[PDB]
Motif scaffolding. Structure first.
Motif, mmCIF file in Angstrom:
data_model
loop_
_atom_site.group_PDB
_atom_site.id
_atom_site.type_symbol
_atom_site.label_atom_id
_atom_site.label_comp_id
_atom_site.label_asym_id
_atom_site.label_seq_id
_atom_site.Cartn_x
_atom_site.Cartn_y
_atom_site.Cartn_z
ATOM 1 N N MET B 62 0.807 -1.212 0.000
ATOM 2 C CA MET B 62 0.000 0.000 0.000
ATOM 3 C C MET B 62 0.831 1.248 0.000
ATOM 4 O O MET B 62 1.717 1.412 0.841
ATOM 5 C CB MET B 62 -0.930 0.057 1.188
ATOM 6 N N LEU B 93 5.409 1.256 9.579
ATOM 7 C CA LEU B 93 4.088 0.614 9.411
ATOM 8 C C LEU B 93 4.009 -0.327 8.207
ATOM 9 O O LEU B 93 3.159 -1.231 8.166
ATOM 10 C CB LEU B 93 2.983 1.673 9.278
ATOM 11 N N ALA B 94 4.889 -0.095 7.229
ATOM 12 C CA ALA B 94 5.006 -0.957 6.060
ATOM 13 C C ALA B 94 5.423 -2.392 6.420
ATOM 14 O O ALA B 94 4.742 -3.338 6.028
ATOM 15 C CB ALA B 94 5.952 -0.341 5.018
ATOM 16 N N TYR B 145 3.994 7.877 0.618
ATOM 17 C CA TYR B 145 4.064 7.173 1.891
ATOM 18 C C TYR B 145 3.711 5.689 1.725
ATOM 19 O O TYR B 145 2.621 5.351 1.266
ATOM 20 C CB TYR B 145 3.152 7.862 2.914
ATOM 21 N N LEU B 147 2.662 2.355 3.255
ATOM 22 C CA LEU B 147 1.916 1.961 4.460
ATOM 23 C C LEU B 147 1.993 0.462 4.770
ATOM 24 O O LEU B 147 1.882 0.050 5.924
ATOM 25 C CB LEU B 147 0.449 2.376 4.323
ATOM 26 N N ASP B 148 2.171 -0.342 3.728
ATOM 27 C CA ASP B 148 2.138 -1.784 3.838
ATOM 28 C C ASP B 148 3.188 -2.277 2.856
ATOM 29 O O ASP B 148 3.122 -1.976 1.664
ATOM 30 C CB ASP B 148 0.747 -2.278 3.424
ATOM 31 N N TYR B 149 4.182 -3.003 3.350
ATOM 32 C CA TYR B 149 5.229 -3.509 2.485
ATOM 33 C C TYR B 149 4.839 -4.879 1.971
ATOM 34 O O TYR B 149 4.938 -5.861 2.696
ATOM 35 C CB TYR B 149 6.549 -3.600 3.241
#
Ligand SMILES: Nc1ncnc2c1ncn2[C@@H]1O[C@H](COP(=O)(O)O[C@H]2[C@@H](O)[C@H](n3cnc4c(N)ncnc43)O[C@@H]2COP(=O)(O)O[C@H]2[C@@H](O)[C@H](n3cnc4c(N)ncnc43)O[C@@H]2COP(=O)(O)O[C@H]2[C@@H](O)[C@H](n3cnc4c(N)ncnc43)O[C@@H]2COP(=O)(O)O)[C@@H](O)[C@H]1O
Ligand SMILES: Nc1ncnc2c1ncn2[C@@H]1O[C@H](COP(=O)(O)O[C@H]2[C@@H](O)[C@H](n3cnc4c(N)ncnc43)O[C@@H]2COP(=O)(O)O[C@H]2[C@@H](O)[C@H](n3cnc4c(N)ncnc43)O[C@@H]2COP(=O)(O)O[C@H]2[C@@H](O)[C@H](n3cnc4c(N)ncnc43)O[C@@H]2COP(=O)(O)O)[C@@H](O)[C@H]1O
Ligand SMILES: [Cl-]
Ligand SMILES: [Cl-]
Ligand SMILES: [Cl-]
Lengths: 241, 271, 241, 271, 271, 247
Positions: B62, B93-94, B145, B147-149
């Motif tokens: 994300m 957060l990723a 940014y 957010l989710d890797y």
């Protein structure tokens, strides 16, 4: 204004043909205190690399259980450029350090030295485009000088597109005004690409042409590297691929 | 100073073969073919207080990109151009192991790579962003940014970026002051751009590597394309190497994928 | 001209009565890679929080012998405000991170996880006043989503004084021009104040009135939090306490 | 905050007495007398893209200094002067136990020491660097890079600096813009300056200490001299102390060495 | 990023009950009642080179606050106001567990809290610091240095600050330049402000917690008051929580203490 | 070559006397007091004329970063810092290059006095703050530290005492002004372990003939000895005041 990059006769701004390398000068073991050292010069791009051989890590937890940790630094001295480059590292300098580190990680046999850090320090003394490649090669040789075993030596050229003409080994000028600038590095004996970047624009064809030319250049450079290893000192007046 | 990542996960010998043995049958874990793209969702104007924004989901990755426009004197070097400042941030957060507070090595690498394929492609025409020549131009802040890797972050950033820019609203320019509710038009965009990443795992090449696939790959290479399929940026990545013919095919594949992805990106943007 | 807040039948600038909450929207488990995640929206303030469940500490000596170490970060994205907020953390952002961390330390049962760090990361995507409370609640829920045991959920509102009128849940505008802005956070079931701040001016009476109102608000919010826990998704159109 | 260096090599008791026992016979390891200088090489205009540059080899120590000129409004404090900004850097190529990333305790100290002996000696006349008075002056950036740590870095910096400055080319000043290929003249230099370091090891005094000698010395003291032999800077250095008469002799020696070193520096510069 | 203090003095279970058992009898270790303030000393104009200064001793806590005035263009945002800048220095000198380097999350929190109760109270009238409107205003630098950590630092800062400001001398304004020995007057101060901190330990509430008391408290809450007792700032502090009625009584106590403290502060300042 | 005159102010005036009315060989007013901070393990305030420094010491304790300690020695952690209101115009709090160099010079100075071997694995913190700068701030700082260390009960070889000595209008002078530091030809801080006749800190900025150097040097000693006696006195009685006096 724009300068003309290929002049009426088919020669470039420095008078080279599209397929000619700049003057190369290499020497090893130039620094007393380093475990391995090398100075590399292509045309006016001048880099110096020092290596600090496999040693344990001061911050214990940051080491690797089966590998050496490569610590690489690409840095441009404030008087390497036409206007004083700031010493404090730029984003460009940071990206390049990573791109170089990764490049070396594929050559160096880091498994041989667990818990150990191998320091590779690089300084550009004059920048004239392809600073990152002169840096990487200087490093590769400094590592070899340090007696650190690698799969192969690393050799590289910037190849590009000038006035719609594909050219080998770029100028400061050619980097600046040409449509494309494409640094390529190899372990030539293994036919392995180690660093590969393009900034600018190319048709898939042009891409493949420039690519073919980059190899021919790299091979000539690779031979001088082999020579520098044996005799500790190499000079090469400019020549066509 | 750059150094080998100590923290990124050393994924066992065994797990790698499992994935390779599947590749040998031309299939992956998630089910897709070797050249397939993960499912793509784009939600435009996501951050309301942005000038333009885009929330991109490429598989489990994300990215939220947002633009913010400002009026500045153009750089003394480039007096006839608006400015572009791409800014990738890899907020922890990723992934399960990240450092916070303004970007590091890869964040910077991602930003510059996205920058170069927007700038060098003239996908965004910076000469068209001049208000008062030499006196005042638009500065386009792009803030990306993660957010989710989910793996293959680069491609998702290119997408989120292009989408955010296309979503960007230009405002009325009161001659001295900006007026942020009389919308004048859109950003001077020539065309969208896509970046396609091909990962070399073992002897196979794989389009859009996921998290697992990234952790076992030798190296990956990314190709930026304009709609008419001119190569507009290339970046090799990873601690391993890649053969000459590897790269040749990589670009071949990257390109005939680029077409498919570009259409799908346009559908999200509305032609 | 200082704008008028209370109009000619006491509704506010956004058309809310002094005792009406803004539209609330909550959803949990929105991030794949986090151990717990939550998006919280009050009116136009939206925050996202990710939690990284109890894990050991990379710097050994910095851990705690009987406790988890809370690592909290409040951060405003550059496009959360009307004019690009600078990404690099401000003094305001630093204080808030501490105020929030402390708030959470009173709820989370940190003793259960010695030597471990619990990471709580927070991002404001749109700021519209009470960003710190939306952030804290997002966190509280992201922690709950992570399955980390706490004493209670945390719920909070900004309560304030407008045109001498005490009002519930402040606007960007109301934060700006009103005499007082007072964020308050609770573990409502335990009747415990977790975060408490006032900036501005209030008579002890007004202070006590606003305080009573803040509770009534908090309770309504707390119910939606309970609901968000069960059904993973909650929407609430504005209304009066 | 400043703290005792942990990193450094604690050189054994035994090794020290080997060196001292030699000092007792008035000789050192490398062969030179107690008051001798290591062999000195200076290569001028080494960095081509500098305005003036100098590569100095004092024994195994290597320093490369380079100047870069720029036009600035002078400090509001000092409106009738050009500016001098020194910067010494101990890049980690120098020595085993060295710091990467922008300069530390030692380096800063080196810079300021070099600075003060150029500035307080008026070896370089800053009042002669004014273009427009109060509006525009020359800023002289001196950047000194230590490449090889052979010991006694201070003296080699002084030398590399003085040499770089003498090598410096001033340019044509188009009235608004600089023109970097019409060379106008040289830097307003009154005279060269030398710094001589004397190390107190045990009861002996030693000129130009090498790497070993530095690691066993109690302390060292450095004297800056103008050609006329006016003291123009002093700096005590090291963890240990030094007697009153120690300093007296130190300066005596430092001075009758200064003459010899100055004569040799001038030979490299062409008077 | 903010994290639980690891260097935080974990004061044993046993020691806590000694103090609580005393609280149960309405007395503390030092002898004072639960609502008493520690002995207060203020020495005005302590730092001579400051515009105004105050050395405050609240119990064993020491704070030295100093003002420094400067002429600046006012912020483009607030064109009819002088500027106030509160910096705070938890000098490592204060406690055995105190790192050095410009402000940490604690030192910043103190500054902002002191700032807000000076600014929001209009104790200092910033509109009364304008020289040429929109062109030039006074910037008031308040620098607060904590020298001895005796607990309840916040209250002692509020005091040192208010005292420093009341000690501040304004200078003659030559129209272009400041003249620092023709004293024109004093700062535009409406009234003094006090901050009172109440600590919840166990079930008891305690005014002005000392070092021990702070290390065992659940949480503390601070109230800022203007002379006719309008609340002008509130800050809850500490890793623990506090009931609704706790806070109610806290403010009750805080306030009927504020009166006594204000009367004593005024005595030090002179009416 | 008309009616032209120098812009730099005269430093040696009527009689022997300087700008503050001192003769070339007179110390400024000294004031010392120990154990002034509760929480420190040792503390001292030192004042020479208008230079007033405070030093706090945090006694031998282990190191938080384990690998950074020393196997047989204490690690000295020293900090010289100028408060923003110590000077005529607000000094910036964030440390300057000047502040960094001085911290090192001072640390090294102390390392020669303190018996760091006695406390392996331990860090000794020495924190210093200049409250008013009036030249020789670094020496007032160092002495404050030396005394704060002594107050902390940390054993040293000797106390450290120091003066700035200089050359004014060609006249060699003892203990410099703010004014004298600026306009004089030379400023030469010197610190000693006077009982051991050991130089601990030594610096010159400016210009001097070897002779002048040696003269100034002799004078510095005479000054240092008078100061050293007050230090001894401050140790015994915890408080010392000295009205200005010639050597
Ligand atoms: N520093 C330096 N000095 C002298 N010669 C230099 C040099 N760096 C390179 N070179 C010369 O180039 C060759 C070969 O290297 P390369 O292949 O990289 O070629 C460069 C070069 O030709 C030219 N270039 C860039 N910057 C230069 C400077 N300072 N001086 C001279 N030439 C310069 O552009 C090529 C590509 O550069 P890069 O890969 O960094 O991509 C840049 C570029 O496209 C553009 N950019 C950034 N800064 C620029 C300046 N100053 N001039 C022109 N173009 C410039 O943005 C890309 C990335 O920027 P990034 O730093 O990641 O982000 C910046 C940027 O977006 C923005 N910013 C700042 N300043 C400018 C200007 N002037 N114009 C536009 N945008 C600007 O702010 C962002 C935030 O960063 P922050 O400033 O906050 O740190 C070498 O061997 C040598 O001969
Ligand atoms: N960043 C940002 N952009 C846009 N909207 C923003 C925002 N942050 C929040 N918001 C919006 O407001 C609501 C609720 O916010 P909050 O509950 O905090 O109420 C705030 C807020 O409304 C307003 N405020 C603060 N910063 C603002 C910005 N950038 N834009 C708009 N409003 C802003 O002030 C209320 C109280 O603020 P705070 O408690 O932080 O105290 C501040 C404030 O009173 C004042 N200050 C600081 N920065 C200011 C700006 N930009 N504009 C106006 N006033 C501003 O100074 C107090 C102390 O600040 P501190 O950081 O501790 O120290 C600074 C300060 O002394 C001085 N300084 C620097 N810049 C300024 C300006 N412009 N004016 C005055 N003084 C200034 O320098 C010190 C040293 O630090 P340095 O600057 O050198 O780094 C959110 O939900 C959202 O909707
Ligand atoms: Cl390059
Ligand atoms: Cl807020
Ligand atoms: Cl000084």
């Amino acid at each position: 204004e724009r300068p003309k990059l290929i002049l009426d006769d088919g020669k470039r701004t420095d008078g080279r043909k599209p397929d000619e390398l700049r003057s190369i000068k290499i020497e090893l073991g130039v620094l007393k205190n380093a475990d391995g050292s090398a100075i590399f010069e292509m045309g006016n791009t001048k880099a110096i690399a020092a290596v600090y051989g496999p040693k344990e890590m001061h911050p214990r937890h940051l080491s690797l259980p089966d590998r050496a940790v490569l610590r690489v630094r690409y840095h441009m001295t404030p008087f390497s450029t036409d206007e004083r480059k700031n010493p404090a590292p730029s984003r460009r300098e940071i990206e390049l350090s990573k791109v170089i580190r990764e490049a070396l990680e594929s050559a160096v046999l880091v498994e041989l030295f667990p818990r150990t850090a191998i320091d590779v320090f690089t300084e550009i003394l004059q920048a004239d485009a392809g600073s990152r490649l002169v840096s990487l090669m200087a490093a590769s040789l400094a590592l070899a000088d340090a007696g650190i075993p690698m799969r192969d030596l690393i050799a590289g050229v910037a190849v590009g597109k000038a006035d719609g003409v594909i050219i080998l080994d770029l100028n400061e000028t050619e980097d600046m005004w040409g449509e494309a600038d494409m640094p390529i590095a190899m372990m030539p004996s293994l036919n392995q690409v180690t660093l590969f970047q393009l900034n600018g624009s190319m048709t898939p064809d042009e891409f493949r042409q420039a690519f073919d030319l980059a190899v021919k250049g790299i091979n000539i450079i690779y031979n001088l590297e082999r020579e520098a290893l044996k005799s500790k000192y190499v000079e090469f007046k400019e020549e066509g691929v | 100073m750059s150094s080998t990542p100590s923290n990124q996960n050393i994924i066992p010998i065994i797990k790698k073969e499992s994935i390779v043995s599947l590749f040998e049958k031309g299939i992956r874990q998630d089910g897709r073919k070797l050249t397939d793209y993960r499912p793509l969702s784009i939600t435009l104007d996501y951050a309301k207080k942005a000038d333009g924004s885009a929330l991109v989901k490429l598989g489990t990755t994300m990215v939220l990109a947002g633009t913010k426009l400002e009026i500045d004197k153009p750089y003394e070097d480039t007096p006839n151009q608006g400015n572009l400042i791409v800014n990738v941030e890899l907020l922890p957060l990723a992934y399960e192991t990240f450092e916070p507070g303004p970007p590091d090595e890869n964040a910077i690498e991602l930003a510059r790579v996205v920058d170069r394929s927007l700038r060098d492609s003239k996908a965004l025409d910076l000469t068209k962003l001049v208000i008062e020549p030499g006196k005042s131009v638009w500065t386009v802040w792009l803030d990306v940014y993660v957010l989710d890797y989910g793996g293959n972050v680069l491609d998702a950033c290119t997408l989120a970026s292009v989408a955010a820019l296309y979503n960007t609203k230009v405002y009325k320019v009161e001659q001295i002051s900006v007026n942020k509710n009389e919308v004048v038009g859109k950003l001077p965009l020539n065309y969208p751009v896509v970046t396609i990443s091909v990962a070399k795992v073992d002897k196979y090449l794989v389009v859009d590597p996921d998290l697992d696939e990234e952790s076992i790959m030798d190296a990956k290479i990314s190709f930026s394309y304009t709609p008419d399929l001119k190569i507009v940026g290339i970046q090799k990545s990873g601690k391993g190497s890649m053969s000459l013919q590897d790269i040749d095919q990589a670009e071949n594949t990257a390109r005939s994928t680029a077409v498919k992805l570009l259409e799908e990106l346009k559908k999200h943007l509305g032609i």
